[PDB]
JSON list of C-alpha atoms in Angstrom, two decimals:
[
{"chain": "A", "resi": 1, "resn": "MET", "atom": "CA", "xyz": [200.83, 170.54, 141.37]},
{"chain": "A", "resi": 2, "resn": "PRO", "atom": "CA", "xyz": [198.96, 172.10, 138.36]},
{"chain": "A", "resi": 3, "resn": "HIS", "atom": "CA", "xyz": [195.60, 173.86, 138.50]},
{"chain": "A", "resi": 4, "resn": "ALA", "atom": "CA", "xyz": [193.24, 174.43, 135.59]},
{"chain": "A", "resi": 5, "resn": "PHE", "atom": "CA", "xyz": [194.04, 177.35, 133.34]},
{"chain": "A", "resi": 6, "resn": "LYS", "atom": "CA", "xyz": [192.95, 180.74, 134.61]},
{"chain": "A", "resi": 7, "resn": "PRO", "atom": "CA", "xyz": [192.89, 184.34, 133.26]},
{"chain": "A", "resi": 8, "resn": "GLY", "atom": "CA", "xyz": [196.35, 185.90, 133.47]},
{"chain": "A", "resi": 9, "resn": "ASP", "atom": "CA", "xyz": [198.17, 182.61, 132.83]},
{"chain": "A", "resi": 10, "resn": "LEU", "atom": "CA", "xyz": [201.01, 182.91, 130.27]},
{"chain": "A", "resi": 11, "resn": "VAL", "atom": "CA", "xyz": [201.40, 180.23, 127.57]},
{"chain": "A", "resi": 12, "resn": "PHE", "atom": "CA", "xyz": [202.63, 179.40, 124.16]},
{"chain": "A", "resi": 13, "resn": "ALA", "atom": "CA", "xyz": [199.47, 178.74, 122.15]},
{"chain": "A", "resi": 14, "resn": "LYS", "atom": "CA", "xyz": [199.46, 176.42, 119.16]},
{"chain": "A", "resi": 15, "resn": "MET", "atom": "CA", "xyz": [197.39, 177.03, 116.07]},
{"chain": "A", "resi": 16, "resn": "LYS", "atom": "CA", "xyz": [197.46, 175.13, 112.75]},
{"chain": "A", "resi": 17, "resn": "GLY", "atom": "CA", "xyz": [200.07, 176.48, 110.35]},
{"chain": "A", "resi": 18, "resn": "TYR", "atom": "CA", "xyz": [201.63, 178.74, 112.97]},
{"chain": "A", "resi": 19, "resn": "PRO", "atom": "CA", "xyz": [204.57, 178.20, 115.38]},
{"chain": "A", "resi": 20, "resn": "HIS", "atom": "CA", "xyz": [203.82, 177.93, 119.12]},
{"chain": "A", "resi": 21, "resn": "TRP", "atom": "CA", "xyz": [203.02, 181.54, 119.85]},
{"chain": "A", "resi": 22, "resn": "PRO", "atom": "CA", "xyz": [203.43, 183.71, 123.02]},
{"chain": "A", "resi": 23, "resn": "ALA", "atom": "CA", "xyz": [199.95, 184.32, 124.46]},
{"chain": "A", "resi": 24, "resn": "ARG", "atom": "CA", "xyz": [197.89, 184.70, 127.62]},
{"chain": "A", "resi": 25, "resn": "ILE", "atom": "CA", "xyz": [194.53, 183.44, 128.87]},
{"chain": "A", "resi": 26, "resn": "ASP", "atom": "CA", "xyz": [192.27, 186.51, 128.76]},
{"chain": "A", "resi": 27, "resn": "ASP", "atom": "CA", "xyz": [189.44, 187.63, 130.98]},
{"chain": "A", "resi": 28, "resn": "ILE", "atom": "CA", "xyz": [186.03, 187.90, 129.39]},
{"chain": "A", "resi": 29, "resn": "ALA", "atom": "CA", "xyz": [184.73, 191.47, 129.86]},
{"chain": "A", "resi": 30, "resn": "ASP", "atom": "CA", "xyz": [181.22, 192.08, 131.19]},
{"chain": "A", "resi": 31, "resn": "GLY", "atom": "CA", "xyz": [178.89, 192.03, 128.20]},
{"chain": "A", "resi": 32, "resn": "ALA", "atom": "CA", "xyz": [181.47, 190.49, 125.88]},
{"chain": "A", "resi": 33, "resn": "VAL", "atom": "CA", "xyz": [181.19, 187.30, 123.77]},
{"chain": "A", "resi": 34, "resn": "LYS", "atom": "CA", "xyz": [181.89, 184.13, 125.79]},
{"chain": "A", "resi": 35, "resn": "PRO", "atom": "CA", "xyz": [184.05, 181.26, 124.38]},
{"chain": "A", "resi": 36, "resn": "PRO", "atom": "CA", "xyz": [182.44, 177.88, 123.44]},
{"chain": "A", "resi": 37, "resn": "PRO", "atom": "CA", "xyz": [182.35, 175.34, 126.34]},
{"chain": "A", "resi": 38, "resn": "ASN", "atom": "CA", "xyz": [185.75, 173.97, 127.33]},
{"chain": "A", "resi": 39, "resn": "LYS", "atom": "CA", "xyz": [187.53, 176.71, 125.35]},
{"chain": "A", "resi": 40, "resn": "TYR", "atom": "CA", "xyz": [189.49, 179.71, 126.64]},
{"chain": "A", "resi": 41, "resn": "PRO", "atom": "CA", "xyz": [189.93, 183.20, 125.14]},
{"chain": "A", "resi": 42, "resn": "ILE", "atom": "CA", "xyz": [193.57, 183.37, 124.06]},
{"chain": "A", "resi": 43, "resn": "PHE", "atom": "CA", "xyz": [195.22, 186.74, 123.46]},
{"chain": "A", "resi": 44, "resn": "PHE", "atom": "CA", "xyz": [198.25, 186.37, 121.18]},
{"chain": "A", "resi": 45, "resn": "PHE", "atom": "CA", "xyz": [201.03, 188.82, 121.94]},
{"chain": "A", "resi": 46, "resn": "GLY", "atom": "CA", "xyz": [202.48, 190.87, 119.09]},
{"chain": "A", "resi": 47, "resn": "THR", "atom": "CA", "xyz": [199.53, 190.25, 116.74]},
{"chain": "A", "resi": 48, "resn": "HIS", "atom": "CA", "xyz": [197.09, 191.16, 119.52]},
{"chain": "A", "resi": 49, "resn": "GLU", "atom": "CA", "xyz": [194.52, 188.78, 118.02]},
{"chain": "A", "resi": 50, "resn": "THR", "atom": "CA", "xyz": [192.19, 186.50, 120.02]},
{"chain": "A", "resi": 51, "resn": "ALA", "atom": "CA", "xyz": [191.22, 182.93, 119.25]},
{"chain": "A", "resi": 52, "resn": "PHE", "atom": "CA", "xyz": [189.45, 180.28, 121.32]},
{"chain": "A", "resi": 53, "resn": "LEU", "atom": "CA", "xyz": [191.51, 177.22, 122.23]},
{"chain": "A", "resi": 54, "resn": "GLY", "atom": "CA", "xyz": [191.33, 174.21, 124.49]},
{"chain": "A", "resi": 55, "resn": "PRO", "atom": "CA", "xyz": [194.15, 173.00, 126.81]},
{"chain": "A", "resi": 56, "resn": "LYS", "atom": "CA", "xyz": [195.63, 170.65, 124.19]},
{"chain": "A", "resi": 57, "resn": "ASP", "atom": "CA", "xyz": [196.97, 173.72, 122.37]},
{"chain": "A", "resi": 58, "resn": "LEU", "atom": "CA", "xyz": [198.18, 175.56, 125.50]},
{"chain": "A", "resi": 59, "resn": "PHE", "atom": "CA", "xyz": [201.73, 175.07, 126.81]},
{"chain": "A", "resi": 60, "resn": "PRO", "atom": "CA", "xyz": [202.65, 176.87, 130.11]},
{"chain": "A", "resi": 61, "resn": "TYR", "atom": "CA", "xyz": [205.14, 179.65, 129.36]},
{"chain": "A", "resi": 62, "resn": "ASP", "atom": "CA", "xyz": [207.68, 178.94, 132.07]},
{"chain": "A", "resi": 63, "resn": "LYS", "atom": "CA", "xyz": [208.15, 175.23, 131.24]},
{"chain": "A", "resi": 64, "resn": "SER", "atom": "CA", "xyz": [208.09, 175.88, 127.45]},
{"chain": "A", "resi": 65, "resn": "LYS", "atom": "CA", "xyz": [210.06, 179.09, 126.89]},
{"chain": "A", "resi": 66, "resn": "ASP", "atom": "CA", "xyz": [213.42, 177.34, 126.39]},
{"chain": "A", "resi": 67, "resn": "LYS", "atom": "CA", "xyz": [211.93, 175.47, 123.41]},
{"chain": "A", "resi": 68, "resn": "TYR", "atom": "CA", "xyz": [209.52, 177.98, 121.95]},
{"chain": "A", "resi": 69, "resn": "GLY", "atom": "CA", "xyz": [210.70, 181.46, 122.93]},
{"chain": "A", "resi": 70, "resn": "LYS", "atom": "CA", "xyz": [213.26, 182.10, 120.17]},
{"chain": "A", "resi": 71, "resn": "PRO", "atom": "CA", "xyz": [212.89, 184.70, 117.34]},
{"chain": "A", "resi": 72, "resn": "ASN", "atom": "CA", "xyz": [210.70, 183.83, 114.38]},
{"chain": "A", "resi": 73, "resn": "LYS", "atom": "CA", "xyz": [210.29, 185.31, 110.91]},
{"chain": "A", "resi": 74, "resn": "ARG", "atom": "CA", "xyz": [206.51, 185.51, 111.29]},
{"chain": "A", "resi": 75, "resn": "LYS", "atom": "CA", "xyz": [204.75, 188.86, 111.60]},
{"chain": "A", "resi": 76, "resn": "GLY", "atom": "CA", "xyz": [204.17, 189.94, 115.18]},
{"chain": "A", "resi": 77, "resn": "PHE", "atom": "CA", "xyz": [206.20, 187.15, 116.74]},
{"chain": "A", "resi": 78, "resn": "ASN", "atom": "CA", "xyz": [209.26, 188.97, 118.07]},
{"chain": "A", "resi": 79, "resn": "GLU", "atom": "CA", "xyz": [207.06, 191.82, 119.31]},
{"chain": "A", "resi": 80, "resn": "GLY", "atom": "CA", "xyz": [205.06, 189.08, 121.03]},
{"chain": "A", "resi": 81, "resn": "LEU", "atom": "CA", "xyz": [208.21, 187.71, 122.68]},
{"chain": "A", "resi": 82, "resn": "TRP", "atom": "CA", "xyz": [208.98, 191.18, 124.06]},
{"chain": "A", "resi": 83, "resn": "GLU", "atom": "CA", "xyz": [205.45, 191.58, 125.41]},
{"chain": "A", "resi": 84, "resn": "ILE", "atom": "CA", "xyz": [205.19, 188.22, 127.16]},
{"chain": "A", "resi": 85, "resn": "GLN", "atom": "CA", "xyz": [208.59, 188.75, 128.80]},
{"chain": "A", "resi": 86, "resn": "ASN", "atom": "CA", "xyz": [208.32, 192.48, 129.64]},
{"chain": "A", "resi": 87, "resn": "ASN", "atom": "CA", "xyz": [204.64, 193.44, 130.14]},
{"chain": "A", "resi": 88, "resn": "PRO", "atom": "CA", "xyz": [202.42, 190.32, 129.83]},
{"chain": "A", "resi": 89, "resn": "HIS", "atom": "CA", "xyz": [199.54, 191.77, 131.92]},
{"chain": "A", "resi": 90, "resn": "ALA", "atom": "CA", "xyz": [199.28, 195.14, 130.15]},
{"chain": "A", "resi": 91, "resn": "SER", "atom": "CA", "xyz": [196.31, 196.45, 128.20]},
{"chain": "A", "resi": 92, "resn": "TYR", "atom": "CA", "xyz": [197.01, 196.08, 124.51]},
{"chain": "A", "resi": 93, "resn": "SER", "atom": "CA", "xyz": [193.72, 197.67, 123.35]}
]
């Protein structure tokens, strides 16, 4: 049975005007900016950007990959696919 989202979880994350995008739930570093209540820090693979999102926009990677994990024209996307599949827990600083 499902838990709440936690740092390290892999997802496709949905943002307006973008396809469901490979991403992870990030940690918040000591001293770093916290997300608003009920939001999570989402690290988008390939682009390496962060946005804050609630669960409605977060689809677990395993369940969703068949639908969402196909190549896309958009910048960063196919790099993102490689990352989530091959080294999703790496530092991308």
